[PDB]
């Protein structure tokens, strides 16, 4: 579709057949979700935000479904003010910025 | 233009007679720039994201020129690791997400 920025671009996603609302963030490199339960093993990782570094759990190749769009990439689970869909996945669904 | 997202959407802006690089961040609500001098009266404010909170100075009706277009709004100035153009100015230049 084509979403305006007059309001937080929050859409829905079905991560592993489960629904959770998240923010489309062109300002994030990766997809970070608040404490969530994904199966499989995971690698701990350090990511940085506006305030510094934080520890987040990493899951590789999880099938995400953004507005009827298939995407399979790495999801990070960790403390985050909001759920975030980063450029890592936004690219797979042909998402672009236009002004 | 049409910014693809396979790499940080960094663009050039112009504020206070200075060229600076900013990030087109649809994930931010306000616009935060690295410590700099702007004219006028400003009020304190805490803004936060992943990593924590940082105290910024808020200036209103500041004229900016995002990668080529006019846009005056609210520019917060503080200890941010990178310049960020939020959804407040992104809309003013009629910016959108299309996938």
């Amino acid at each position: 579709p084509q979403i305006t920025l007059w309001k937080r671009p929050l859409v829905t996603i079905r991560i592993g057949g489960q629904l959770k609302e998240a923010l489309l963030n062109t300002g994030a490199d990766d997809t970070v979700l608040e404490e969530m339960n994904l199966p499989g093993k995971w690698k701990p990782k350090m990511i940085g935000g506006i305030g510094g570094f934080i520890k987040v759990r990493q899951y590789d190749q999880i099938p995400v479904e953004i507005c009827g769009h298939k995407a399979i990439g790495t999801v990070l689970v960790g403390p985050t003010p909001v759920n975030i869909i980063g450029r890592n996945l936004l690219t797979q669904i042909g998402c672009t910025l236009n002004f | 233009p049409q910014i693809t997202l396979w790499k940080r959407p960094l663009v050039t802006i112009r504020i206070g007679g200075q060229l600076k690089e900013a990030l087109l961040n649809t994930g931010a609500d306000d616009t935060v720039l690295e410590e700099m001098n702007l004219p006028g009266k400003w009020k304190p404010k805490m803004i936060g994201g992943i990593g924590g909170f940082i105290k910024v100075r808020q200036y209103d009706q500041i004229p900016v020129e995002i990668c080529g277009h006019k846009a005056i709004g609210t520019v917060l100035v503080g200890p941010t690791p990178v310049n960020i153009i939020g959804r407040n100015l992104l809309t003013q230049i009629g910016c959108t997400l299309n996938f």
């Binding site: 923010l23 963030n25 300002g27 994030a28 490199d29 990766d30 970070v32 990782k45 350090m46 990511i47 940085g48 935000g49 506006i50 570094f53 990070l76 985050t80 003010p81 909001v82 975030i84 980063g86 | 940080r8 990030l23 961040n25 994930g27 931010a28 609500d29 306000d30 935060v32 404010k45 803004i47 936060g48 994201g49 992943i50 990178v82 960020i84 939020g86």
Partner: peptide, 9 residues
């Protein structure tokens, strides 16, 4: 290093 900048008031 992985950079993610969402901001909230």
């Amino acid at each position: 290093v992985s950079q993610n900048y969402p901001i909230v008031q």
